[PDB]
């Protein structure tokens, strides 16, 4: 509820074109993570590669890359911690990996 | 030629190569974790250190400081004369010559011909995607194993504080509403018996990696894209750059620190041909390893001349008894 | 030119570089860890010492005291006049001048041609980003390794209480010993901004002296004469109450017009022969090295002039250039 | 003017309100032993009390502090945002120049007011009355002392020494020239109390000039005469004038110096040289 | 629960305006593969806390809020209870993940 | 847990509303590979106890919480059996971790 | 470790409700890398005991117990027997900072 669209936006901005910075290692780490720790490291690295996206958008005139809302991080933490079953954890990680590739409203 | 230096060096009261602390008045020093046998049970101790990256930077500084004396110093970049480690860092598709000339980033041979920095320390040009490894390779500077064993690890940190003084034409310091400009910073102060070891893979000076050798009648020979005396001067300057690395120009805030700098003992090997890396001084049994290496490398047809300072090195391995480093430079350059 | 002055000086009861822990009455004298050889192995002992920041700040004080008397002493920072070494502190974008007219930090050429302090002792402006390394490399102040190993340590420190409602008691730490220093004046780029060291106007390396040669010579004279207070009593803090005793037990000074290495200090068991070897090898390499000695024994094939101090040597060095 | 004095006296049964260390000379040993010598704070307090005694008697010496009369030199201690002048007018510590104009002890010996932040480096450098190495070598006494008067900074605020009106280097004097001369004379005369009931003067040597000059080697050593010769010859050869005064000591030859037979003669020479 | 306050302060290190960045501490407290360097980076952030307070009260922002002591000791008990590297790494990454979020600190 | 006194005292030593601002002591306490500098740092921390006690009434400030004898006894008991630098640095950095907090600063 | 008794004995010399605010003794005791100055400090602390006990009996609260010999004895035969400065320095500074605790001393 809410995390879907914002996570998709941010991951697309990390992966989409018009950036020349195509980081798939973070996407692969998020996807292939049976345990929750590596999924958390992958999403943390994706969030960490925020300043590069902001600086590049400012330099090339692209719209600023929106950062996911704190409530989205809240929901992420709750569903990761409350779901100790590796099945739902893998489902969530692969859903994030799917949202890493999306053709949103890119630079005009 | 690929000359290798190593040995044991004592640094006392040095504030070299701090870490900044991340935005704190208390400046963190470079702390590296090392392993000591410690008889029955091994130990891991975090001790002050000097990184090999900054050692390479200071070797660069010494090389470019001793290269301007040569008549062929025009090829040296003017950015090197001011001790700049930048090389094609951010969006630098061109290079600035010492005589105010623009140098392109194509034809790597021309790049190393027109830039001494490119020849000696390599380059990275992300815009044009040009790569060249640094011929000089510096090892880390850490306190040797017997030092930790004898001092039982210790801390080697005193953390002396430093402040400012202001009068601002008023006789006072002033509160935060005017600027204060009085800062209390405490920088960690270290010591110990360290180990200095840097290799100078100088056999590639003037030889681009793109076409290192040529075969006109099917024989290997270095590709010397420059005239010979320029290469000889570059080799001489690179060897002379070893001199400040042992008299002492390395270390952070050299103006305020200038640690008392000398090597307790030293080993140097010329080794015109490719050889194994000379072992860096950190250990206790390296004497036996060095003795065996020197005594059995000649069986492989290696004409390596060894200069020894404050080491007996037995009596059957031949060596040159030395007491300085510029004598080493002189005897290294009198043959090349 | 580049000069390097190393010296062993005997000190007694000096309250130099003492801060204490916060606001406590007891004030410790920055006893740092040093390594000695002895016979049982390399041991670390906490011995009192004087930081190189102290030495370089007092070299600054001497330089600004001997620069006013020069005819070209007008081109000095207002902070230099007020014994303030802090250059371009928190938030400082512009600069203050002795004459009163401020100067903008648009580049280094003006900050070198107008601010002799910025040239001699470097500076740092956080706002404008102007950066320059100081030409005064100040070493530390440590006791001799032989002295430490023969004095049995005993912390080399004693506590002395000082009296003064407004009536309070505070104590200070007092030390002694044959300390040593090695001050390096790499004054070969004075009057030369770091941004443009060599212009190469006609394909030949030459210094870019932004100032006239007279001002450069005067700055050299002042900076070298600033070594005189280093052996007189103007070293360290608490000089109003302490004024440590100074006597130059040993002195060596190596000067040249070209890039030359430093020299091995005397904080070790065996250093004199190492100094002989390095001096003779540097001379044999082809460096115009002039070596001056005071109360130190020399060997063969090496010059040894029984000089009195450094001021006369600096005077004749200026005379012969 | 700048003057430096170094001498040696004999103290016997001294009563104070300290104990320090002395280091053995020569090559037999370089260890230290505890000796009840005199701290430099005592010497500076003696100089301060002599200064106030010889300055309050002058008709122009009415710019002192009430705490200075009773030899209580707290110099703006805890909970002291202002100062109490000798006449009675409470001076407010707002600027350094006001302190320089209204105070004299704070001029000669510096000041520090933490509440207002005001600070001034003292121009009087006081050293320690330490025993001579021969005393501890042959006894296991002769005590050496030294003092430095940087009187050229008297009346000169630390904030700015030169105003630079017409681009000239002139000192930023803020008090009347007569008051400055009286303060210099009183500071020079303040050398009497430590040079004059049980102790007697045995050796003394002083150098006085105008520009910044090195201080003498302290009378703590054995072969310090060579250092004094080096300093005197170097000061003579550097170029500026320098006046050398000797008291019961044969300094050297082939130079010019004044052999003073009394402390009053030395005081008069210092007074008349400025 | 007890991650919001400390995570909020962690995001105070790097965010909109606040012209002073410190990502080394965040990286250290994120991938705390061993029992330590986690509290080390958190302490480094707490040492920059007065810097953040001064910058906020000076330039454009309301004063920052230090994490509550009960939060700090809850974190300490949580890191004491865990023994396997899994829980330690998960806690470290969840702690340092909040440093990059859309927070409206300076209006 | 049995540490509120020490944490509150260190906070009042380091936080605002006290115009003392002893950060050097906290830096000495935090990064302590060996026991010497950790003990010197804790000594420097407890050194300005009389200053805080006497200066509290100079403004209308409640007196600080001096560490309890039992707390310091437990710390001394648990610091003696220290050989590996890891847990020693852990303990020192945790001391510095509750040194910074957001207590009720002098209500 | 039997350090509680000596710490309690030394605390009464520095703690409140006592005019004898001799603060230099603990600093002299702590930073004692050599046995000579530590011995001098402990001897002067023991010689200052009669003033402490007379002040305590004048106040009304019970004075500290008589200085026992075995604890101080074991003090020297553990401080001088160990050659390395680490343990002797840490024990000296620890027993010096032991005095910096406030509890029900003189009601």
UniProtKB/TrEMBL annotation, chain A:
Taxonomic lineage from the root: Archaea, Methanobacteriati, Methanobacteriota, Thermococci, Thermococcales
Cystine bridges: 62-107
Protein name in UniProt: Uncharacterized protein
Automatic annotation (TrEMBL), chain B:
Classification via Pfam families: DevR
Keywords: Antiviral defense
GO process terms (BP): defense response to virus
Protein origin, superkingdom: Archaea
Function description: CRISPR (clustered regularly interspaced short palindromic repeat) is an adaptive immune system that provides protection against mobile genetic elements (viruses, transposable elements and conjugative plasmids). CRISPR clusters contain spacers, sequences complementary to antecedent mobile elements, and target invading nucleic acids. CRISPR clusters are transcribed and processed into CRISPR RNA (crRNA).
Name of this protein: Type I-A CRISPR-associated protein Cas7/Csa2
Species, as recorded: Pyrococcus furiosus (strain ATCC 43587 / DSM 3638 / JCM 8422 / Vc1)
UniProtKB/TrEMBL annotation, chain D:
GO biological process: defense response to virus
UniProtKB keywords: Antiviral defense
Protein's UniProt keywords contain Ion transport: no
UniProt keyword Membrane, yes or no: no
Superkingdom: Archaea
CDD domains named in the record: Cas7_I-A
Pfam families to which the protein is assigned, alphabetical: DevR (PF01905)
UniProt function note: CRISPR (clustered regularly interspaced short palindromic repeat) is an adaptive immune system that provides protection against mobile genetic elements (viruses, transposable elements and conjugative plasmids). CRISPR clusters contain spacers, sequences complementary to antecedent mobile elements, and target invading nucleic acids. CRISPR clusters are transcribed and processed into CRISPR RNA (crRNA).
Designated name of the protein: Type I-A CRISPR-associated protein Cas7/Csa2
Organism: Pyrococcus furiosus (strain ATCC 43587 / DSM 3638 / JCM 8422 / Vc1)
High-level lineage: Archaea, Methanobacteriati, Methanobacteriota, Thermococci, Thermococcales
